[PDB]
Amino acid sequence: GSLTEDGLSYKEKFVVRSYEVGSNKTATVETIANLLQEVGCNHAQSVGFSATTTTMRKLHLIWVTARMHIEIYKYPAWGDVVEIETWCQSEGRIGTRRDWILKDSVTGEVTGRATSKWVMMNQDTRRLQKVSDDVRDEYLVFCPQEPRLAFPEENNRSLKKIPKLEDPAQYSMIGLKPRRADLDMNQHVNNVTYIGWVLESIPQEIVDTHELQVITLDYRRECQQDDVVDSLTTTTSNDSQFLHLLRLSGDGQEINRGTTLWRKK
Amino acid sequence: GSLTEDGLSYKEKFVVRSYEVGSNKTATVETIANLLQEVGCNHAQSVGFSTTTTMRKLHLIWVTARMHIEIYKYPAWGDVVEIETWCQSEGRIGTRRDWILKDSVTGEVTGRATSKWVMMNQDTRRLQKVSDDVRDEYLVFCPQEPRLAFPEENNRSLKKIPKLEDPAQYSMIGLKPRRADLDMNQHVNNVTYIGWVLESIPQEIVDTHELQVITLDYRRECQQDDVVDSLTTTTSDSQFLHLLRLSGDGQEINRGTTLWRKK
Ligand SMILES: CC(=O)NCCc1c[nH]c2ccc(F)cc12
Ligand SMILES: CC(=O)NCCc1c[nH]c2ccc(F)cc12
């Protein structure tokens, strides 16, 4: 992987592995979600990070994901190479936004794209806060100054409001517990695990006859190792839409909400 | 990745990814187990496998009966690790696949693994322990002289694993596999069982020790609609005896041992 000529975006090529593919011999949405987070880690390392500034570490502040939107047109096949370009942008005092562009390494065609809204949170008290000026000055030198959106569209699905699933849910997957493989290098449940848990309540028939095109996922609270999650789904609709909800089985506290769009094969 | 000059073993270099490391910033044993599986797939593809020879006509597949993994140093996030794999004939009993993990910078052996593969009918699960006429179709891809990753006589890889007696010292119950735990054929992969075995190891042991050896005997496959129980007992460096069984019936699906060292 490497920074582009301007040093304002990062590119990386990944070869799809045997354990990264599903029933139709192509990369899963969780494998794609993993590749997006791996290229973000290398973009931070290349521009001089370990992605918190000296001021952020001093004040015990971290960047957390508030929304993850992923749209796929073609999933890379096992053995195929996929090139991912990522970049961050300042969204004023609200926070930052990280975008991605997935391309076929042979044809150069855009086979997918993603966007995410990141917020600033105190690592210790969990209290969110608007980006201060001194923090913004340290990041701006690594972001393009003119707007560069992966989802520019006049009426895009990345900025759509997600409602709360009303009970009873049409489908459900109960008693979901994270294992050590679901933890990251800091012993926290990986954000990609929530993607898997959301798709657990989608009926197997829908999976076997449809392909996942869009997935918007709003993050509300982190799930601890000793917590048990419930996955709820309802069909809100060749295209099929679903409303999703992840809540603690022990009290119904909401940890996640989302939508998925699927198309016929 | 590529076949060696003789075409009797395959080499591949992997860069350790951010999502592949644990709390100590190094690759997990499941990430290592995945890299071993990935290099075995590419070795099969390079020698002409779309894996399976005329066994396609007879409905026969290769299944893992034993997986033994020894690690001395786990690669760090960002480090490159070179893995060399090869298969060998173990008479009409079956086939044995070995691995050698090395540091790409120093060339030092940081780990090694071995596995016993058997032949099974994919439909009836009968398992034809014996094999004939099909050995010739593979022998041309195996070294003829013995090449063992674990040569030592009376070694940890060929040790008999006993059944954990009840009550177990530690336990992790109600384990269910998700879609990410399935392979390209919708079966629960042999790597998920490694994770489920280590689930019953206390968190305190994990935080103060590093996993050195892991021997795992496969007895029965776990379905998507099956629920597993992970049982552990300290048999002692720290050794443990492991057992994976179906939550209800107590039908054994796996058994093993893990050896851990102080940090
Ligand atoms: C993903 C994330 O932390 N985004 C907000 C911090 C940020 C702003 N501009 C960047 C450029 C490169 C980089 F690695 C991080 C940043
Ligand atoms: C156990 C296992 O790996 N596969 C059984 C088939 C097999 C036997 N000898 C080989 C040599 C290279 C190769 F790619 C496959 C084989």
CB within 8 Å of A81: residues ≥ 6 apart: A13, A14, A15, A16, A105, A106
- Identify the CATH homologous superfamily for domain B170-262: Hotdog Thioesterase (3.10.129.10)
Dump the DSSP string for chain B: -EE-TTSSSEEEEEEPPGGGB-TTSBB-HHHHHHHHHHHHHHHHHHTS----STHHHHTEEEEEEEEEEEESSPPBTT-EEEEEEEEEEETBTEEEEEEEEEETTT--EEEEEEEEEEEEETTT-----S--SSSHHHHTTS-SS---SS-SSS-GGGPPPPPPPSSPSEEEEEE---GGGB-TTS-B-TTHHHHHHHHTS-HHHHHHEEEEEEEEEE-SPPPTT--EEEEEEE---EEEEEEEEETTT--EEEEEEEEEEE-
Q: Which of B16, B9, B177 is nearest to B84 (CA)?
A: B9
Q: Which of B129, B180, B262 is nearest to A178 (CA)?
A: B180
Q: Sort strands A96-104 and A128-129 into parallel, antiparallel or unpaired.
A: unpaired
Structure tokens at B232: 């552990």
| Partners of residue B258 on adjacent β-strands | B214, B240
Give yes or no for a contact between B18 and A190, defined as CB atoms under 8 angstroms apart.
no
Distance from residue B187's CA to the centre of ligand 2 (Å):
20
The one catalytic residue in A186, A191, A210, A244 is A186
Give yes or no for a contact between B100 and B148, defined as CB atoms under 8 angstroms apart.
no
Q: How far is CA B36 from CA A6, A31, B12, B210, in A?
A: 38, 18, 10, 20
Give yes or no for a contact between B222 and B186, defined as CB atoms under 8 angstroms apart.
no
Residue A17: CB atoms within 10 A of its CB come to 18
**Rounded distance, CA A234 to CA A172, Å?**
9
The one catalytic residue in A88, A223, A244, A256 is A223
Give yes or no for a contact between A260 and A242, defined as CB atoms under 8 angstroms apart.
yes
Give yes or no for a contact between B86 and B9, defined as CB atoms under 8 angstroms apart.
yes
Domain residue limits, chain A: 2-159, 171-264
Tell me the technique behind this structure: X-ray
Give yes or no for a contact between A3 and A10, defined as CB atoms under 8 angstroms apart.
yes
CATH, domain A2-159, list 3.10.129.10, 3.40.50.1370, 3.20.20.150, 3.30.70.360: 3.10.129.10
Buried-state track B170-199, b at ≥16 Cβ within 10 A, e below 16? bebeebbbbbbbbbbeeebbbbbbbbbbbb
Of A25, A177, A190, Cβ closest to residue B19 = A190
Q: Domain A171-264 carries which CATH code?
A: 3.10.129.10
**Domain B2-154 in CATH 3.30.1490.20:** no
The reply to whether domains B2-154 and B170-262 share a CATH topology is: yes
Distance from residue A53's CA to the centre of ligand 1 (Å):
10
Q: Do B176 and A181 touch (CB under 8 A)?
A: no
In terms of phi and psi (left: phi > 0; alpha: psi -120 to 50; beta: otherwise), the region of A62 is beta
Q: How far is B19 from chain A (nearest CA, A)?
A: 7
Ligand 1 surroundings by CB, under 6 angstroms: A 40, 43-44, 47, 49, 51, 63, 88, 96, 98, 118, 139, 142-143
Distance from residue B189's CA to the centre of ligand 2 (Å):
18
**Rounded distance, CA B30 to CA B20, Å?**
9
Q: How far is CA A159 from CA A63, A67, A260, A263, B203, in A?
A: 20, 9, 14, 21, 41
Of A19, A38, A175, Cβ closest to residue B19 = A38
